[PDB]
Design a binder for this molecule. Structure first.
Ligand code: NA
Ligand code: NA
Ligand code: NA
Lengths: 314, 43, 147, 235, 256, 299, 210, 243, 224
């Protein structure tokens, strides 16, 4: 009786592996249909403001997050810069971060389609979910006036304009499936931990420089913070069903384990807020027919997942 | 968990009746064409 | 597939998948080969061995398909594109290809789909024949002996 | 049946279920659902009968796909040990032309075709798993079947429909309106290639120009006029 | 040279590991191959050197200068290496670049004070290396060329800084030398040939300045085929060998 | 590989046709193709059609910071990235390719460096702001003459383009939508036009290098079929000030100097027509826009 | 950059003895993996290695294995690219001495070292970081099932990194970059003690874990 | 502004309108690095040209069954100018244009068809630069290719001519190249036929022909020089090799 | 209410080509295939897709990469890929005019890209499983109305934006599947399903119109 390990079976016949597992009410990732992977978070451990008592001088990380789901790890770090500005709920008044996603797989070289699309979609979804107002990125410049004559002190208000620019570096270790959701959630927690450094100043122009210790809260709209979910729609093939000693379709949550990623072509992805509103929805009917029922169950599961991810910490 | 072992093998159709399975096993118990020609050439 | 040989890609060596990461999802949302995306155009040959989903490549020559009747073997009746074939390594070959053989009872097609990968899975019925459960139609392969 | 009907991919197939129907281009038999479904946009074409009717969809295409018994015009792009590497169309997968695949051909007597030569051949093998194969002889008897080298002519790129219409439809006036002006040799390749050679370069050029202009125009009756204006030898 | 057969490698290794070692050209373990050097041929530059080895390895070094504020530019000496047939991205090129930058670090590679003009300004030294040809590790080759170039380098003379229009002062400094050694069995070899480097068990990069064995010191695989471990006494042997046979390289290079 | 396979009969046919003073599309050797310039929608959007050759250009601008080296000059870049849309022989974005680098360099030398655009007129304030004008060429269909078509497209676009009026109060600037204030055109100093000559060697190389009676054939604005078979290529950019804006004979079949001069002069004869055509079509566009406004103010 | 979101160009960046934990096989999409965390007084480090291989190589047939080593900056861009590539080359030499390359013709082994965390509260740190790199790479290679003639170990003292095999009898690596001038012997002894401890810990980790 | 051309008819360097800079060449200067080689000095331009081949193609791509592959690598060192360039030039579009220009120049001169399935790599190092560098590159390539024994139809002589107001100046240096438009010429042998014709800045059409007239002549002189070296180097190394 | 302009077979050196225009959004697409793929693109049992999207202004970025990704998600199940094993289909879209504020939105461009790609695939003669139609839909800030084919102005004040690409069979009367639904902004379930019903109707309208446009210029090419 010839036999293949689950790994190499997932390599050889992903569809058959998926169907066979689903015939037993389980998945090749050893979770049942609507069972998410648990998540664990280490928040603000890499930031320079990690320790208020002993602030790291060399560090330039404004925000930090370390997420772990299943066996996949995501490390997100928020750095910053300043741009000189020139010259409602509408989208014009909102901002976004500029993320660089680095999914650690065997290769070395320029960005893959995965990394590029995940980065861009992170940016765009941050913009459209309206989590970060442009107003919150405005810098209130203090001025460095000289102590008597002999050194220098800075005065902040309790004359050009300026704006904060946030950058995100997101590295993904031990990828086993689609990692956009993990990146989004990690970036959310990371954004919640960001502290904006205070800034001061002295055809010719003087540079603006950030204060070493002082920092103000990055005030984001907590109302609009959503969390990410993904789902697969699988059509059961009668021949590949196990004996377990007329067509059916099942909904699957939190895809993983290659067999699922290779076989499933009908996918749903949601950014859902704890309040009840939805920030993003993506339907791709590459395989099985996407019915309204599936959409509704997906929205339900996305919202409970959102409540879960927003409540489980603090 | 996962004691069936029917999932980690070659595709065998769920539909298939036992008799035809016996037919297949029978066919594979008989010598392969390689075996026939080989034994013929050896004799 | 060609009249002279069958080109294959090694997916696993001794119950061990190679490579460990096939590169699924690397190239986007469609159905894309390991190097059919943006990453393949910008790969650093200088700093890495091979790209993400790159596999060891192999060749099963028509002569090395069978033990007997090696002179007149039709590879089109033995394998089809997409088939999963259990083979044994004859030689290291060159940098591009290993040289493989199926000239044994336990070697050959272990998985196959009707209509050249388009249809449903077929099961091995006889040494040189598989059949589809839903259609009933038979297709000609060189089947590796199960059990 | 006899009435040809316009059809889109995904539309319901309108032929008689109880009547056996051999399926040509445009019609796809789904490997999983076993459903008969149209996959090309164009005109649905049902032949009378015989023994079974042919259902096919004539659709506008520019890209040739090798099928057996097709007469094609290729260009030699490579020489191998026992075969030629041939191109039936730029950017397309090449086709093999055996060295044995010639009249009076043995291992001692080889064909004299070089890279860059035009070959007029017949698609003898077009398996979906293998590289296509062409031939320059009658596979049965082994003698010349009107195939072989095409020398010193001019080649014309054309859509598949035009070429098929040119080879099969005898009511097509282009050849007739061309014959009205000059004597010419023509080779028609279903791969969308038309070879033309006249005794005088001027006349061959005229043929080229008028054939291409006729190809770009959908109206058939215009041809004569075009030919006239083209054989008036304007610049 | 490179890509020797297993038979050739075995022969060469057996000769090089025997006691005493038999080198393919009959050199003593401490003997260098004939080279010749030319200087002062690039007028546009402050210094210039060209070194040619007997095996064909040829290198060119240019010395240029520019005024910089120490405070904004703490590094007053920068080495840029360009090897022909190798991209600037290449591992070996960046390795050699880093190494050379460390041998010549203004910190203690050379005397920084010799560069100072004013308490706010100085000359930054740009050392540009162009390896035309190399059949072995070119680190010593480059090092020697740089030594020669620096020992024949002239800079504009100070009188915001203004400079003399026609008169220039010779840059006085003791440039360091980097030596490369081949570890073959229990034998240490100086100036390893390509074939010697193909079978060497390992290698030793040893810097040298003012008559002292200075840093950087590296162990370096001269190949990937026969890289083996070595005993510490060999390292000691290499160091002793350098500090014994270095002053003669110094007096040979500094006699003009 | 993606190579265009050309047969011996085709090469010999076209070459022999050139020997008998014949071109496939019925043009004389010195006959440039009828240029069809079509404007549409916003300013700086132009489509150029030479026979079957089809290109499209889109002019745009955004506020930026002047380069540190040049304090008074604005920013101007031109992009000519080929795509498989023009033909499968083109790889997607091979900017390091021979013909790609050549094309880009010719256009850049013709427009960006010739001072065809007033870069100092782009400057808003010397220290902190300037206009960043961009010219993006889109190659839609390739039947040869891409350099010339690109030059015409870029120029017509630049002349058609209008940046929004703005004014400045020290640190701050005030930018206007069309309703606030009318847009103003860019500063065009001259109109560079490129003409591409293709050279064919009817005899053997020996006759070209060491033979008298030069039989080297020259034609203007070659088609794709002609471009694929040519042995040499010259691109000459001129303006109506009888200035040789630039000349590029980057190798290829050696040609007699006098012939090249003749080429330059005939090219001038062509760029006169093309320039007058561009100006005319521009003014007609503006007039039709005005008359449309007049039709809009009163029903 | 056309392949990244770097944001506005006008913007400018914001300016303003030791315990060991060793684990293996926690990264699922590679062959081998190792987590090494080190804690000394007022100094904490932590890094991860991943061995992808044996994989296929582009190019001509190679008679033996080809090892690549890639150092990746973690969090802070702490080190120079040139120095990273130099250290990479050093490690390449070491594990070219250690790995049984004969077993892997026409094959490449790619090793990645992520320098996630390196915060030392004390107020050229490459030297002190190299031995942990070597530890992690040896662990990950053993975890990947990549054959090793020995367990490559190392130690650091006075800017002198020394990497040993065979119970410290012989040297596979020697790195000396300034870091003051002291005699060689005691640096050898200290680095050898570090090596022996690291070796014991690594075998221990390979016996509780694999 | 300064007397580029004095009423006396002299230039800043002291040359007249129709005089070449100092032109010296050396052949077989790197016998252990390349099949052919040349070191060349034109004015202050100092260039090393290395020709490797014909040889086996590195890849089993880039192999042509009908002709040899010709590659040209131009290395403009950071120390070629007075002010060191902090940036490499290797991937600049200017350098790529120069490379492709030289390649397409010598594709029609070198008999590639008699070296099929081979690759000819040309490796150039510009050690020092002082204007008119294109013609210098051309000359270096010609010399090195001839030294390699690689067959070609004729010499190709490179020269530059500036246009100051009405008068053309032969073989321009760096100062002359600035504040003046220059034409670069690649002339085949002693013929009037041009391999290369490069004009990168605006020039009055009616005065272009004249600029070519002297240019060609100058190029001819350059040929006579290169030739003069080769023969000597030939005459020397064909007599000493005897007995 | 919704009227579109569309043309077919406008490019000479490709197998198929199309021009799609909706409001101010103007996109031209080309298709070449089935042709020989390069080894890295090749798939054993099915057609491989090379998909390219070029912006109207500037040069291709990650934005266009996402556009290519979604376009691929739409076109992959559309094409009968198993008819062309080990072959390539080259699909290139050149956005001529965005018809929307590029920095904030790209849904118009995406929809027109899908429509144009479909039309070009039809013109090329490539086997398609079924028909397809895509529309952009917006929900406004104050009115909270659902606008099909929203203008750039309407987009500026939109509360949410949506791309709806549906797959049609049987004369365009039956919805086989939803190929793509890309929803971004703030919305709820009720709004979603209202948007889906209206969207489906309008998309059916678009399918009908597209059928007519296709037959209008394909029919004269063919023989009775
Ligand atoms: Na290897
Ligand atoms: Na000459
Ligand atoms: Na003269």
């Amino acid at each position: 009786p010839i036999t293949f390990p689950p790994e190499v079976l997932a390599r050889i016949s992903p569809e058959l592996s998926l169907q066979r597992h689903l015939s037993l009410g389980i998945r090749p990732c050893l979770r049942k249909y609507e069972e998410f992977r648990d998540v664990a978070i280490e928040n603000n451990t890499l930031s320079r403001y990690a320790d208020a008592g002993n602030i790291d001088t060399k560090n330039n990380i404004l925000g930090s997050n370390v997420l772990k789901s299943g066996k996949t790890i995501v490390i997100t770090s928020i750095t910053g810069g300043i741009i000189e500005e020139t010259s409602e709920d509408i989208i014009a008044n909102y901002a976004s971060v500029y993320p660089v996603v680095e999914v650690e797989r065997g290769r070395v070289g320029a960005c893959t389609d995965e990394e590029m699309t995940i980065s861009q979609k992170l940016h765009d979804s941050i913009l459209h979910s309206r989590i970060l107002p442009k107003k919150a990125l405005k810098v209130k410049a203090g001025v460095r006036s000289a102590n008597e004559d002999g050194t220098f002190s800075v005065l902040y208000p309790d004359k050009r304009k300026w704006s904060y620019v946030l950058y995100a570096k997101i590295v993904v270790l031990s990828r086993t499936g689609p990692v956009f959701d993990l990146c989004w959630n990690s970036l959310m927690y990371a954004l919640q931990s960001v502290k904006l450094p205070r800034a001061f100043i002295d055809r010719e122009t003087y540079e603006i420089i950030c204060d070493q210790t002082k920092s103000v809260p990055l005030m984001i709209n907590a109302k609009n913070i959503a969390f990410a979910s993904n789902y697969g729609i699988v059509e059961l093939d009668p021949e590949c069903q196990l004996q377990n000693s007329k067509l059916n379709t099942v909904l699957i949550a939190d895809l993983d384990t290659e067999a699922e990623e290779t076989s499933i072509h009908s996918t749903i992805s949601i950014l859902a807020a704890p309040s009840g509103n939805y920030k993003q929805l993506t339907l791709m009917g590459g395989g099985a027919k996407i019915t309204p029922e599936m959409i509704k169950r997906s929205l339900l599961l996305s919202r409970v997942r959102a409540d879960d991810l927003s409540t489980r910490f603090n | 968990k996962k004691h069936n072992n029917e999932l980690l093998g070659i595709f065998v159709p769920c539909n298939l009746p036992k008799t035809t399975r016996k037919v297949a096993i029978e066919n594979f118990n008989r010598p392969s064409p390689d075996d026939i020609i080989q034994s013929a050439q050896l004799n | 597939l060609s009249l002279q040989r069958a080109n294959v890609e090694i997916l696993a060596v001794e119950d061990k998948p190679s490579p460990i990461d096939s590169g699924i999802g690397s190239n986007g949302s469609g159905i894309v080969a390991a190097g059919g995306g943006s990453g393949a155009a910008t790969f650093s040959v200088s700093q890495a061995s091979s790209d993400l989903g790159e596999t060891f490549r192999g060749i099963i020559r028509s002569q090395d398909v069978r033990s007997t009747d090696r002179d007149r073997v039709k590879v089109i009746e033995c394998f089809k594109p997409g088939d999963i074939v259990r083979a044994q390594v004859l030689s290291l070959g060159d940098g591009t290809n290993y040289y493989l053989t199926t000239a044994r009872n336990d070697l050959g097609v272990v998985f196959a789909r009707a209509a050249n990968g388009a249809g449903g899975l077929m099961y091995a019925t006889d040494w040189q024949m598989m059949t589809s459960p839903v259609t009933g139609a038979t297709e000609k392969r060189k089947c590796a002996k199960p059990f | 049946d006899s009435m040809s009907t316009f059809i889109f991919p995904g539309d319901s197939f309108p032929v008689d279920p109880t009547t056996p129907v051999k399926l040509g281009p445009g019609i796809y038999c789904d490997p999983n659902t076993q459903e008969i479904r149209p996959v090309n946009t164009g005109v649905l074409h049902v032949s009378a009968k015989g023994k079974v009717q042919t259902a096919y969809i004539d659709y506008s295409s520019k890209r040739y796909i090798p099928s057996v018994n097709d007469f094609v015009i290729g260009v030699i792009i490579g020489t191998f040990s026992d075969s030629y590497k041939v191109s039936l169309q730029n950017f397309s997968s090449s086709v093999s032309l055996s060295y044995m695949a010639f009249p009076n051909a043995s291992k001692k007597n080889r064909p004299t075709l070089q890279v860059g030569d035009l070959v007029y051949a017949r698609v003898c093998t077009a398996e979906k798993e293998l590289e296509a194969e062409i031939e320059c002889f009658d596979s049965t008897t082994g003698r010349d079947a009107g195939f072989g080298i095409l020398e010193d002519g001019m080649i014309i790129d054309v859509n598949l429909n035009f070429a098929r219409q040119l080879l099969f439809n005898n009511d097509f006036p282009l050849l007739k309106v061309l014959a009205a002006h000059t004597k010419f040799e023509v080779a028609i390749g279903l791969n969308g290639k038309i070879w033309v050679k006249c005794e005088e370069l001027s006349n061959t050029l005229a043929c080229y120009r008028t054939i291409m202009e006729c190809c770009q125009k959908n109206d058939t009756a215009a041809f004569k006029d075009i030919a006239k204006r083209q054989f008036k030898e304007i610049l | 040279h490179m890509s020797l057969s297993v038979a050739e490698k075995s022969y060469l290794y057996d000769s090089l590991a025997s006691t005493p070692s038999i080198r393919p050209d009959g050199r003593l373990p401490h003997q260098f191959r004939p080279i010749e050097i030319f200087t002062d041929f690039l007028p546009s530059s402050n210094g210039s050197s060209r070194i040619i080895a007997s095996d064909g390895s040829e290198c060119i070094v240019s010395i240029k200068s520019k005024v910089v504020d120490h405070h904004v530019e703490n590094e007053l000496l920068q080495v840029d290496v360009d090897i022909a047939g190798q991209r600037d991205d290449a591992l070996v090129v960046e390795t050699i670049t880093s190494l050379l930058n460390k041998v010549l670090k203004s910190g203690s590679g050379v005397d920084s004070s010799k560069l100072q003009l004013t308490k706010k300004y100085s000359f930054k030294i740009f050392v540009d290396v162009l390896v035309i040809s190399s059949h072995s590790h070119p680190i010593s080759l480059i090092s020697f060329a740089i030594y020669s170039a620096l020992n024949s380098t002239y800079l504009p003379k100070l009188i915001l800084p203004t400079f003399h229009d026609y008169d220039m002062v010779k840059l006085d400094i003791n440039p360091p030398l980097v030596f490369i050694l081949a570890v073959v069995g229990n034998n240490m070899l100086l100036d390893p040939a390509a074939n010697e480097s193909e079978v060497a068990n390992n290698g030793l990069i040893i810097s040298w300045s003012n008559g002292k064995i200075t840093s950087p010191i590296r162990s370096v695989a001269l190949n990937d085929s026969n890289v083996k471990s070595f005993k510490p006494h060999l390292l000691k042997q290499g160091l002793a060998m350098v500090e014994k046979y270095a002053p003669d390289v110094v007096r040979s290079l500094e006699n003009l | 590989a993606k190579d265009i396979e050309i047969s011996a009969s085709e090469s010999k046919f076209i070459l022999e046709a050139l020997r008998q003073n014949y071109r496939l599309d019925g043009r004389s050797f010195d006959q440039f193709r009828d240029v069809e310039i079509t404007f549409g929608k916003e300013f700086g959007d132009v489509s150029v059609k030479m026979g079957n050759t089809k290109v499209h250009c889109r002019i745009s601008c955004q506020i930026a910071q002047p380069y540190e080296d040049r304090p008074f000059e604005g920013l101007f870049v031109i992009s000519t990235e080929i795509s498989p849309m023009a033909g499968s022989q083109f790889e997607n974005g091979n900017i390091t390719g021979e013909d790609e680098v050549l094309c880009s360099r010719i256009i850049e030398k013709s427009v960006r460096r010739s001072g065809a655009l007033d870069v100092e007129g782009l400057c808003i304030v010397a220290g902190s702001k300037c206009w960043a004008v961009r010219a993006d060429v889109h190659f839609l269909d390739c039947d040869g003459g891409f350099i010339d078509a690109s030059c015409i497209a870029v120029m017509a676009g630049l002349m058609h383009f209008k940046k929004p009026d703005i004014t400045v109060h020290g640190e701050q600037i005030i930018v206007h939508p069309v309703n606030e204030r009318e847009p103003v055109p860019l500063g065009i100093l001259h109109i560079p036009i490129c003409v591409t000559f293709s050279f064919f060697n009817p005899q053997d190389t020996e006759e070209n290098i060491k033979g008298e009676t030069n039989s080297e054939i020259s034609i203007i604005d070659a088609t794709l079929k002609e471009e694929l078979l040519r042995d040499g290529v010259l691109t000459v950019t001129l303006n109506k000030n009888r200035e040789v804006v630039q000349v590029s004979k980057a190798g290829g079949l050696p040609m007699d100097a006098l012939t090249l001069m003749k080429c330059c002069h005939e090219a001038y004869s062509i760029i006169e027509k093309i320039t007058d055509q561009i100006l005319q079509l521009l003014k007609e566009d503006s007039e039709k826009r005005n008359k449309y406004a007049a039709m809009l103010t009163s029903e | 950059d056309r392949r990244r979101l770097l944001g506005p160009a006008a913007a400018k960046p914001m300016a303003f003895e030791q315990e060991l934990s060793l684990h293996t096989g926690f990264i699922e999409n590679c062959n081998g993996s190792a987590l090494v965390e080190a804690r000394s007084l007022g100094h904490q480090t932590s890094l991860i290695t991943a061995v992808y291989g044996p994989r296929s190589i582009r190019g001509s047939f190679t008679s033996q294995g080809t090892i690549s080593i890639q150092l990746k900056n973690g969090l802070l861009e702490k080190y120079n690219t040139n120095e990273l590539k130099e250290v990479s080359s050093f490690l390449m030499g070491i594990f070219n001495s250690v790995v049984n390359l004969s077993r892997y013709p026409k094959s490449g082994i790619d090793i990645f070292v992520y320098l996630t965390y390196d915060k030392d509260l004390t107020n050229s740190q490459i030297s002190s970081l190299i031995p942990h790199c070597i530890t992690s790479i040896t662990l990950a290679l053993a975890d990947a099932g990549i054959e090793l003639v020995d367990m490559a170990g190392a130690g650091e003292a006075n800017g002198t990194v020394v990497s040993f095999i065979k119970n410290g009898e012989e040297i596979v690596g020697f790195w000396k970059d300034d870091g003051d001038d002291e005699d060689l012997l005691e640096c050898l002894d200290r680095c050898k003690e570090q090596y022996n401890r690291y070796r014991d810990l690594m075998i221990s980790c390979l016996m509780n874990q694999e | 502004r300064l007397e580029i051309y004095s009423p006396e008819g002299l230039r800043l360097d002291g040359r007249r309108w129709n005089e070449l800079r100092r032109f010296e060449s050396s052949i077989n200067t790197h016998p252990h690095a390349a099949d052919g080689s040349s070191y060349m000095e034109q004015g202050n331009n100092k260039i090393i040209t290395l020709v490797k081949g014909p040889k086996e193609p590195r890849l089993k791509s880039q192999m042509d069954t009908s002709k040899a592959l010709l590659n040209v690598s131009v290395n403009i060192t950071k120390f070629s100018k007075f002010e060191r360039s902090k940036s490499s030039h290797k991937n600049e579009r200017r350098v790529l244009e120069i490379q492709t220009s030289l390649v397409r120049m010598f594709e029609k001169n070198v008999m590639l068809n008699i070296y099929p399935r081979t690759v000819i790599d040309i490796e150039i190092h510009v050690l020092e630069q002082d204007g008119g560098i294109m013609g210098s590159l051309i000359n270096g390539i010609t010399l090195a290719l001839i030294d390699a024994g690689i067959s070609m139809f004729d010499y190709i002589s490179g020269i530059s001519v500036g246009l100051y107001d009405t008068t053309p100046l032969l073989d321009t240096n760096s100062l002359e190249e600035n504040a003046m438009s220059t034409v670069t010429l690649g002339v085949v042998g002693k013929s009037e036929k041009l391999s290369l014709l490069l004009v990168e800045d605006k020039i009055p059409l009616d005065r272009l022909e004249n600029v070519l007239a002297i240019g060609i002549a100058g190029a001819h002189r350059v040929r006579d020089l290169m030739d003069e070296e080769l023969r000597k180097h030939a005459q020397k190394r064909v007599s000493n090799a005897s007995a | 209410s919704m009227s579109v302009q569309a043309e077919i077979g406008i490019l000479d050196h490709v197998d198929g080509s199309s021009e799609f225009v909706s409001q101010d959004t103007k996109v031209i697409c080309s298709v070449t295939g089935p042709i020989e793929p390069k080894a890295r693109q090749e798939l054993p049992t099915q057609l491989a897709l090379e998909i390219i999207v070029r912006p109207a202004k500037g040069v291709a970025t990650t934005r266009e990469k996402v556009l290519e990704d979604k376009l691929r998600a739409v076109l992959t199940p559309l094409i009968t890929r198993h008819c062309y094993p080990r072959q390539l289909c080259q699909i290139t879209c050149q956005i001529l005019e965005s018809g929307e504020d590029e920095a904030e939105f790209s849904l118009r461009e995406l929809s027109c890209c899908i429509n144009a790609a479909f039309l070009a695939l039809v013109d090329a003669g490539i086997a398609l499983n079924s028909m397809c139609a895509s529309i952009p839909i917006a929900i406004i800030k104050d009115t909270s109305d659902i606008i099909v084919d929203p203008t750039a102005e309407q987009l500026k004040i939109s509360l949410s934006v949506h791309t709806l690409a549906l797959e049609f069979v049987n004369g365009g009367k039956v919805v086989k599947n939803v190929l793509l639904l890309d929803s971004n902004g703030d919305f709820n379930e009720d709004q979603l399903f209202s948007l889906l019903e209206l969207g489906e109707q309008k998309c059916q309208e678009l399918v009908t119109n597209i059928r007519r446009i296709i037959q209008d210029n394909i029919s004269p090419r063919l023989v009775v």
